[PDB]
């Protein structure tokens, strides 16, 4: 009967999903080999309750259950974005626009650094394993997609890296697969800011012994912020503190000086090496494919210690076709920072969104026509201005098409977006290519093309604003039921619908 | 037995039998209310409304059937209304509908058969010149800011040369002008001269006979909406589709032959020198653009004939999905597949997704057949676009999208996935700058291109470059395609046992 705080406590997050009939406790035996992933895919794709696998083949009492689909969508009556809202402590019926706007509001709140709590107050310290007890291959790690390169333990946990300084601490979410009984490999240090952390340990001669922690079931607000392209120099932990209104509670690792969320379900500790590598991938990814390929070497992470809760739970994300966490979190958090960038640059943008149906490749910008008309500009000048602002930033990396639409389009409703897309831009003539900007390595039309090795271009800005809308008012009828007819007539028809004979 | 392809009233009966028709006996206003009710039904794929009590109607003139080819629930067969136009099983898929139309082109055409007037329901009531009062009919005002009441949204114009050598069944929009006249753009700019001059060549330049028929055999309204090749007889193709001749009777005031079981027949003459502004009309792309009015020739109604309790079928175009998408779009797709077959292109199927407002044509490419061409994307996009945009089939199409044969092009979930993930913006799009633009496309009509009417089309390659060489294997990461059939079955079998509903 406690007051639940789902942004702060992963177990409160599970409880609120229980209370909202949005979680199935599966007690049948489920195989981590493919069965988990297929069940989650069925659930994602019909917007069904999240599965909690309590009986995985090969699990011990404490290691582990699996919570699938932590930010999948659900039925509209419950609040279809409820799982995302719960990562922020918001009402389950909060809209995605309200979620984005709240994240922007939190950039103005007091940032709060983490607070250390007594280890006796830290559930993640209930059980502690030393090196000789580390046995990664005995864990019920899921094999999520056919042809995945291995079992991906890390799809919804948080990597922690820090300079020897302690001046810079990074929380991130790169995928990670199990290599053998003692090692993991993943793309944690691909982004340049995280590689610099790694380099700072090499400068002291620890290039093969960079400490890391990997934490599962962290405060949901922390996993969300770890998935955000927040500006450089902003501390992730302190922004999480701002979202929660309180500091993240942390404790020190057993084997290094890193601090981990005290309520983590499980914490893996060790060191990564810049010299020792192993082939990584492939992995079924956010654009809906597992592509077969030679595979690429990635740094090796050696696990040297572990700590975990009783009856620990591994949160799992199984990416693919819409809609999963790579769309509801990665795409919508890019949209959040795209709205921020618009506000800071003075562009006349009301909202931004990355439609799930476009696999987080399309960024829709809803343009305030009053503001646009005051610029007294041309589509070509505006498309250049917009593309130049976005495609040279961390925010624009994953985005391959920016779509400009007038303020009469609900950009959160793909029915309105696809209509505006097909009817308001001339193919090719209304698209401006950006040939020189960094391409997104994962986009399938990039990775399956010669552009995978030049890594430049293949982006555009698409103008779906009518020419007249750059200049003055343009009054047209939208020919559907709700927008096409007098509101009182719509009322009368809705009120008499059953009297007519309809269900 | 019921023959819904031959008989409009059998068509209504089968929808009733399939729990897919609501008889509305509440009084409904033809001014906006009919249109609003049909939009609600289209957009949630609900039963067709049959308005039996229109404000201002007489006993016989008329009821309105809305949404005659709208979509319905999947368990009923979501394309059942279209299937019934052709006499096919209600659960027939759209691919099977298209392939049936294609097979019927290879069948012996069957010309119409004249039946006696006593056996023609459309002759049950006859109104001569002195009883024509079009303003007394409960014609709908379908969209806000339409230019007038549109009587003709789901009927059939019939025109013919005096030779009786050229006959045309067509579907241009028709607006009521006043108590005696209608207006619309029935004659295309490619026929205007031969019809004008041929009727002028007997002193009848301003007196071209026409008939306008409603509630025709559903196979005929379908064929009338189809861009079949020039020179093909619409009536004889309808006959091949039906497996029997269409029964016809002659008009009262001219020698045109009309379907004997038509609900209503309007007849008269056209004048080319006398014009009236027509439109705007809410159309296939989802807009009324206000004040846009354009001059059209004037049609004088001189006689009318109709059944007891006559029924006007009505289409109310707008946002997807309505007849401009399920019929106009899919019939362009049908002819697009025929053109692929005749030109030797390696195309399995063609479709115009309803969500793209009949502006996108998806072509499902046989990857083996493509690889045998030993070609490149640039060459293949050029070849495809050149073939399609020099034909009448390509007119309404502004983007042709090429996808591999792993895509179910009839499912927009797979289409949008392939579109966004398999083409590089701009780089994988070939513009066609000189081909005729579609006058109605909003990005054309609301731009300077409306004056030039060339270009603004493209072919978009959504086939991975390597698929031109070999059909490389990748995993599609969803439930039904991503996992072995045995696992999919087991998960579905155990779903409720897990605890799901």
From Swiss-Prot, chain B:
* Catalytic residue positions: 283
Its cofactor is: Mn(2+); prenylated FMN
Signal peptide span per the entry? none
- Gene Ontology terms, MF aspect: carboxy-lyase activity; metal ion binding
The set of disulfide-linked cysteines is none
- Keyword annotations from UniProtKB, A to Z: Cytoplasm, Decarboxylase, Flavoprotein, FMN, Lyase, Manganese, Metal-binding
Q: Which Pfam families match?
A: UbiD, UbiD_C, UbiD_N
Q: Which GO terms describe its biological process?
A: cinnamic acid catabolic process; ferulate catabolic process; ferulate metabolic process
Give me the residues that bind prenylated FMN, please.
168-173, 190-191, 234, 392
Catalytic function, reaction form: (E)-4-coumarate + H(+) = 4-vinylphenol + CO2; (E)-cinnamate + H(+) = styrene + CO2; (E)-ferulate + H(+) = 2-methoxy-4-vinylphenol + CO2
For this protein, what is the EC number? 4.1.1.102
Task: Cite the NCBIfam families for this sequence.
Answer: UbiD family decarboxylase (TIGR00148)
Something else the entry says is:
Present with 861 molecules/cell in log phase SD medium.
Q: Which PANTHER family match?
A: 3-OCTAPRENYL-4-HYDROXYBENZOATE CARBOXY-LYASE-RELATED (PTHR30108), FERULIC ACID DECARBOXYLASE 1 (PTHR30108:SF17)
Instruction: Sum up the protein's function in the record's words.
Output: Catalyzes the reversible decarboxylation of aromatic carboxylic acids like ferulic acid, p-coumaric acid or cinnamic acid, producing the corresponding vinyl derivatives 4-vinylphenol, 4-vinylguaiacol, and styrene, respectively, which play the role of aroma metabolites. Not essential for ubiquinone synthesis.
What is the protein's given name? Answer: Ferulic acid decarboxylase 1
Query: From what organism does this protein derive?
Result: Saccharomyces cerevisiae (strain ATCC 204508 / S288c) (Baker's yeast)
């Amino acid at each position: 009967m406690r007051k639940l705080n789902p942004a702060l406590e992963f177990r409160d997050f599970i409880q609120v999903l229980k209370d909202e009939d949005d979680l199935i406790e599966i007690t049948e035996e489920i195989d981590p080999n493919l069965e988990v992933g297929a069940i989650m895919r069925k659930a994602y794709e019909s917007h069904l309750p999240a599965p909690l696998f309590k009986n995985l083949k090969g699990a011990s009492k404490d290691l582990f259950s699996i919570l699938g689909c932590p930010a999948g969508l659900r039925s509209k009556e419950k609040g279809d974005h409820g799982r995302i809202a719960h990562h922020l402590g918001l009402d389950p019926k909060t809209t995605i626009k309200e979620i984005i706007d709240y994240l922007l509001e939190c950039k103005e709140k007091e940032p709060l650094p983490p607070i250390t709590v007594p280890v006796s107050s830290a559930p993640c310290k209930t059980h502690i394993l030393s090196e000789e007890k580390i046995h990664l291959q005995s864990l019920p790690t899921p094999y999520l997609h056919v042809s995945d390169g291995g079992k991906y333990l890390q799809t919804y946990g948080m990597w922690i890296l820090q300079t020897p300084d302690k001046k810079w601490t990074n929380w991130s979410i790169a995928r990670g697969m199990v290599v053998d009984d003692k090692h993991i490999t993943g793309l944690v240090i691909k982004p340049q800011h995280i590689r610099q952390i790694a380099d700072s340990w090499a400068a002291i001669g620890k290039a093969n012994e960079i400490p890391f922690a990997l934490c599962f079931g962290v405060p949901p607000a922390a996993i969300l912020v770890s998935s955000m392209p927040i500006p450089e120099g902003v501390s992730e932990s302190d922004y999480v503190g701002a979202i929660l209104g309180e500091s993240v509670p942390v404790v020190k690792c057993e084997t290094n000086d890193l601090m981990v969320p005290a309520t983590s379900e499980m914490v893996f500790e060790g060191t990564l090496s810049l010299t020792d590598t192993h082939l990584e991938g492939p992995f079924g990814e956010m654009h809906g494919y597992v592509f077969k390929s030679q595979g690429h070497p990635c740094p090796l992470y050696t696990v040297k210690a572990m700590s975990y809760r009783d009856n620990a739970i591994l949160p799992v994300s199984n990416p693919g076709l819409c809609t999963d966490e790579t769309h509801t979190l990665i795409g919508s958090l890019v949209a959040t920072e795209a709205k921020e960038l618009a506000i800071e640059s003075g562009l006349p943008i009301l909202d931004a969104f990355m439609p799930y149906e476009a696999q987080a490749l399309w960024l829709i910008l809803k343009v305030d026509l009053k503001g646009l008309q005051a610029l007294k500009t041309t589509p070509e000048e505006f498309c250049k201005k917009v593309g130049d602002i976005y495609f040279r930033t961390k925010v624009g990396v994953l985005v391959h098409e920016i779509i400009l639409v007038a303020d009469d389009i609900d950009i959160f409703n793909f029915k309105e977006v696809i209509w505006a897309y097909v009817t308001r831009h001339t193919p090719v003539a209304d698209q401006m290519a950006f040939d020189d900007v960094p391409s997104f390595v994962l986009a399938p039309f990039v990775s399956q093309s010669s552009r995978s090795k030049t890594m430049k271009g293949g982006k555009c800005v698409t103008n779906c604003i009518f020419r007249q809308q750059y200049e003055r008012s343009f009054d047209y009828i939208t020919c559907n039921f709700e927008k096409g007819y007098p509101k009182g007539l719509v009322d009368k028809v809705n009120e008499n619908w059953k009297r007519y004979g309809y269900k």
